[PDB]
Design a protein around this ligand. Structure first.
Ligand code: FMN
Ligand code: FMN
Ligand code: TYR
Ligand code: TYR
Ligand code: CL
Ligand code: CL
Ligand code: CL
Ligand code: CL
Ligand code: CL
Ligand code: CL
Lengths: 185, 184
């Protein structure tokens, strides 16, 4: 009934069915995202929809390689969190998802990154509305993925959003109570 | 429908005098708090500024910085601000009943990306609740941070004046999304 319910229900999806959602469902989510505010109304988001299996595999293996090295080297709170949740460098969802939605920011636009991540928040809620799942996937290095898809120098790959029908995704992680202070710290 | 909420939402830089109930802001923060974040760090922190003197200080600090910004701005930037009739004046920093300051946890991985994602949620929630907002980014964050005794571990991301809308200014255009497939 409420946006809160939609936001509450929405959780990471890293398990996907093979079945291809209608393009319109994914395009819907871009149309919602595109209504978002942005610095100087530049609308600095650009979308690349990757579906080609060979290309998905190339992207998967580049990310996995990058991740494997990262997993050898990560420390601190991130390592502790990844270890406890038994994450590894393997990223099968980059092949299994029917879409990889690559989201780029226009580097030259003011507050381009802030604006695109804001729009991604819109986008994720829209996907949830359509019964699609995703995960903001951010490999350690984006340069090689950018090269794989011939990214122009003007654009920065922000995130890989695998999108598909969820396949019994694991439960939402907890949320701490929101932390609100008044007037000053 | 979510598209309707997103499509209708526009910037609000002019607010009614009446103060909305705090519940509606808190609702919006609870929505934001449901957003994903890198390693589920939930790296957002919120400061609600209501005190009139403090809002005034924030307003004055930002305006002084904007004055300098506007003295010097040129090119594309200048043309857009001119055509939209922006000036260094930011009266809504004083006149909005609430300034919602959004901070990111500097040390949290993916903190900036996560907080701005959550700001997306937040803005939709404010719209749902019938409130207006503008993501105001001051030219000098540090001066504002000091005004509210920001701890060194936090980074101010954005000032969101929040109130009942009183802004007739129409939403600016949105170009149709043009997608690409597989490669550029
Ligand atoms: C990251 C970001 C920073 C912004 N900074 C400012 C700002 O400093 N001053 C301002 O008046 N509006 C600011 N805005 C609001 C934009 O100008 C506004 O979102 C854009 O004009 C589109 O407005 P509309 O949704 O009503 O079409 C900012 C928006 C974003 C997303
Ligand atoms: C900026 C950002 C980057 C993320 N990067 C990754 C990632 O690289 N790999 C991954 O599996 N999940 C990634 N996530 C998903 C988070 O792990 C997830 O949002 C968090 O665990 C909360 O999940 P939940 O909403 O299901 O509770 C990312 C999320 C955000 C916001
Ligand atoms: N921060 C400046 C410039 C600005 C305005 C609107 C924007 O979307 C971005 C930047 C102002 O408020 O006037
Ligand atoms: N990118 C790495 C590490 C990571 C995992 C989850 C996150 O939320 C953030 C980072 C992975 O996908 O395994
Ligand atoms: Cl997620
Ligand atoms: Cl415009
Ligand atoms: Cl950049
Ligand atoms: Cl899952
Ligand atoms: Cl806005
Ligand atoms: Cl957790």
């Amino acid at each position: 009934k409420m946006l809160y319910d939609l936001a509450k229900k929405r959780k990471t999806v890293r398990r996907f069915k093979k079945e291809k959602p209608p393009l319109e469902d994914l395009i819907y989510s871009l149309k919602v995202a595109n209504e978002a505010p942005s610095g100087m109304n530049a609308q600095p988001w650009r979308f690349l929809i990757v579906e080609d299996e060979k290309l998905k595999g190339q992207i998967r293996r580049v990310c996995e390689r990058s991740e494997k090295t990262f997993y050898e080297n990560v420390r601190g709170r991130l390592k502790e969190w990844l270890d406890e949740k038994r994450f590894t460098w393997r990223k099968p969802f980059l092949k299994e998802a029917p879409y990889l939605l690559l989201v780029f920011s226009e580097k030259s636009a003011p507050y381009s990154r802030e604006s695109v991540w804001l729009a991604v928040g819109y986008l994720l809620l829209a996907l949830e509305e359509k019964g699609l799942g995703s995960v903001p996937y951010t490999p350690p290095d984006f340069r090689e993925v950018e090269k794989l898809v011939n990214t122009p120098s003007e654009l920065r790959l922000e995130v890989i959003l695998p999108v598909g029908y969820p396949d019994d995704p694991k439960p939402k992680y907890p949320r701490n109570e929101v932390i609100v202070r008044y007037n000053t710290f």
